[PDB]
Amino acid sequence: KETAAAKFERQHMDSSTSAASSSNYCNQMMKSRNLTKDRCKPVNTFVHESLADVQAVCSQKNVACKNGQTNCYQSYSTMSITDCRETGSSKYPNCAYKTTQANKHIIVACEGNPYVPVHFDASV
């Protein structure tokens, strides 16, 4: 089975690119990371930082998760991220996305030993 930590890396980590490279970035990425296999995932965020940097967030600012749990943490510094929003004209299996680059603080939920990121909660 794919572990929770590995799933987070697959759905959210992209250190190979410093920013949202192109307008076609989300269409290629959502497809290659298997996020459109069962249906079109409406929104998803990719983080362009090292794995070490994102893992360190688990020891940063503790904040409440959107779901009410208390295992969420916000990064002290802004990070390069790319938001993918499914455009209305998107129709499974032809999923379509709008690529958007930004620099914001990320909020992730952490779990386990080692305490690592397992879910992307929000960007602020």
Ligand X SMILES: Nc1ncnc2c1ncn2[C@@H]1O[C@H](COP(=O)(O)OP(=O)(O)O)[C@@H](O)[C@H]1OP(=O)(O)O
**Could you tell me which residues are annotated as the binding site for substrate?**
7, 10, 41-45, 66, 85
Quote the DSSP letter at residue 92: T
For residues 16 and 59, give the distance between their C-alpha atoms in angstroms, rounded to a whole number: 24
**34, amino acid identity:** N
Position 20 contacts ligand X (CB under 6 A): no
User: Which region, judged by CB under 6 A, interacts with ligand X, from 5-13, 25-33, 48-56, 87-95?
Assistant: 5-13
Position 7 contacts ligand X (CB under 6 A): yes
In this structure, the chain runs to a length of 124
| Residue whose structure tokens are 């990371």 | 33
For residue 55, the minimal CB distance to ligand X (Å) is 14
Provide the 3-class DSSP secondary structure of residue 13: strand
**Which residues 57-76 are close enough to bind ligand X by CB under 6 A?**
65, 67, 69, 71-72
Position 28 contacts ligand X (CB under 6 A): no
Position 119 contacts ligand X (CB under 6 A): yes
Active site residue 105: no
Tell me the residue ranges of DSSP E strands in 1-124. 43-47, 61-63, 72-74, 79-86, 97-104, 106-111, 116-123
Site residues, ligand X (CB under 6 A): 4, 7-8, 11, 65, 67, 69, 71-72, 109, 111, 118-120
